[PDB]
From a paper:
However, they possess a surface exposed loop, the CD loop, which is a region of low sequence conservation. We have demonstrated that the CD loop can tolerate drastic diversification in length and composition and have established its suitability as a locus for peptide grafting. In the Z1Z2 variant carrying the decorin motif KLER in the CD loop of Z1 (Z12KLER), the motif replaced five native residues so as to become inserted between residues V45 and L51. This insertion point was chosen as the V and L residues in Z1 corresponded to the natural flanking residues of KLER in decorin (VKLERL). Decorin is a protein associated with cartilage homeostasis that binds to collagens and plays a role in their stability, organization, and fibrillogenesis. In decorin, the KLER motif is located within a loop of the leucine-rich repeat 3, the region that binds collagen and the incorporation of this sequence in a PEG-peptide co-polymer promoted chondrogenesis of human mesenchymal stromal cells. Interestingly, the overall pattern of exposed Lys, Glu, and Arg side chains with a buried Leu sidechain is preserved in Z12KLER, but the main chain adopts a slight helical turn that causes the side chains to be positioned closer together producing a compacter KLER motif than that of decorin. Given that loop sequences can undergo changes induced by their binding targets, it remains to be established whether the observed difference affects the biological function of the engineered motif. In conclusion, data on the various variants establish the suitability of the CD loop as a locus for peptide grafting, capable of supporting the display of bioactive peptidic motifs on the ZT polymer.
We have developed a functionalized, modular biomaterial formed by the controlled self-assembly of two proteins. The ZT polymer is composed of proteins of human origin produced recombinantly in bacteria. It is based on the naturally occurring complexation of the protein telethonin (Tel) with the two N-terminal immunoglobulin (Ig) domains, Z1Z2, from titin in the Z-disc of the muscle sarcomere. Specifically, its 90 N-terminal amino-acid residues become “sandwiched” between two antiparallel Z1Z2 doublets, forming a wing-like hairpin structure that builds an intermolecular β-sheet across the three components. The display of peptidic sequences on the ZT polymer is established, with sequences having been introduced both in Tel and Z1212 components without preventing polymerization. Both components permit fusing peptidic sequences to their N- and C-termini and, in addition, Z1212 permits the introduction of motifs in four internal positions, namely the CD loop of each of its four Ig domains.
Author numbering: 1 to 195
The structure:
Amino acid sequence: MATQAPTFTQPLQSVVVLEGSTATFEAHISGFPVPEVSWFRDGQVKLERLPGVQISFSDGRAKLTIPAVTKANSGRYSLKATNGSGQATSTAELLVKAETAPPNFVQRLQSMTVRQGSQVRLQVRVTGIPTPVVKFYRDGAEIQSSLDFQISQEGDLYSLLIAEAYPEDSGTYSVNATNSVGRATSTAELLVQGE
């Protein structure tokens, strides 16, 4: 209701972002009348002139997102909010790193002896940048995920859940994790006893 120069309630913060991911910047702006906002890269380059960006603004929340980020997106990013009483600027740097790491089993496949009808969970925890591809095998054959053999991922934790184990399920289970910079394999034996 009373006039007041623009200000950033939440400013931009510099961030390091992994190659290929989506970088996002968000700010909260106040001011009356409602400030007009413009995004810039490297000082003088109007951001809406560069391809592959999404800029939105509503109710004093300004958001810039850059999907599929690459090293060419690194630079200094600025948000300018302006009305008749003044003009405010928030600036942050975006640095895009590769940061590659080959696949690593922080939790290895674990050998197990269970009884028939038991439910058995075969878990690994796998790190890696780019995120590795994780596949489960029994005796060298890839396991197709089904309701009885259910492969799932939660974070870096990958689980094969055998709904009810029978002797026919015994064998050497293995997990392969591969990304663009390395490979890793964990093997284990599963034995399920009969009658």
